[PDB]
């Protein structure tokens, strides 16, 4: 369960992410597709070439969904409702795939936030992400 310190850690980290969030989300997707191709199976339609605009844009929707969840840290399950149906009902995305994307968000954030990516925040960001993935996977059957 996210804690107060957690909550606070995450607001300060994502806050620095600020405007570059769409960028960070697409970088995340790139790291994933490259480091774990199995994930590609869920995007047989995207153009996944380095620099793809289909990715950059999808990247942004993820970043935003994340900012939204940031903004409703206390009611995440109901804020993300819509996305949990999508991922778990229309798409049906195995939950391991979320661990993977999660991992790449962290690496991505770690590569862009030296001062910020401290052990305690790293621990907070991982909890948050597990939290989001848990919501987004909640209605699987």
């Amino acid at each position: 369960v996210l804690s107060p310190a957690d909550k606070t850690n995450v607001k300060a980290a994502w806050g620095k992410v600020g405007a570059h969030a769409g960028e960070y989300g697409a970088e995340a997707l790139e790291r994933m597709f490259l480091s774990f191709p199995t994930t590609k199976t869920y995007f047989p339609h995207f153009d996944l070439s380095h620099g793809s605009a289909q990715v950059k844009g999808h990247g942004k929707k993820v970043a935003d969904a994340l900012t939204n969840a940031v903004a409703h840290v206390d009611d995440m399950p109901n804020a993300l409702s819509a996305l949990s149906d999508l991922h778990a009902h229309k798409l049906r995305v195995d939950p391991v795939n979320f661990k993977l994307l999660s991992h790449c968000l962290l690496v991505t954030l770690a590569a862009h936030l030296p001062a910020e990516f401290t052990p305690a925040v790293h621990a907070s960001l991982d909890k948050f992400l597990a939290s989001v993935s848990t919501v987004l996977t909640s209605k699987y059957r």
Partner: protein
């Protein structure tokens, strides 16, 4: 280990820039902070109660170095990891009783520590290769469990 020579080359070039002393400490450190159930294996290490107790714990810092040493020594033998780590897998199994699943956490935590130190230089393709390396180390460390 399915590591194209191009992949193999990036791995090495990055690793030459690595301050193994420091990286080992950080990695083992974050592992104990981020997945604190992994602290049970090291109760001989003294205080582990706060992020700082850990990151700064000398026994942590020393053991981290040992760990990275074993790691570098696998990067000098990508083609026979199972053998390189055969004594070490065995030990972690029989004497330490560590769930091999923790080797993957360490690995991913390693990768985040590389990303933290190197920056944009830790590109998706270099990460990608690095993920192949940590997975192999991990598989190789679980290989002798029975």
């Amino acid at each position: 280990v399915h590591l194209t020579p191009e992949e193999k080359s990036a791995v090495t070039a990055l690793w030459g820039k690595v301050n193994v002393d420091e990286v080992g400490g950080e990695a083992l450190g974050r592992l104990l902070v981020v997945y604190p159930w992994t602290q049970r294996f090291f109760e001989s290490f003294g205080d582990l109660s706060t992020p700082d107790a850990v990151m700064g714990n000398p026994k942590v810092k020393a053991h981290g170095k040992k760990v990275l040493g074993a790691f570098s020594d696998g990067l000098a033998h990508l083609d026979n990891l199972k053998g390189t780590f055969a004594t070490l897998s065995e030990l972690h199994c029989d004497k330490l009783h560590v769930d091999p699943e923790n080797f993957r956490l360490l690995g991913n935590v390693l990768v985040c520590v590389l990303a933290h130190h190197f920056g944009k230089e830790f590109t998706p393709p270099v990460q990608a290769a690095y993920q192949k390396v940590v997975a192999g180390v991990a598989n190789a460390l679980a290989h002798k469990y029975h």
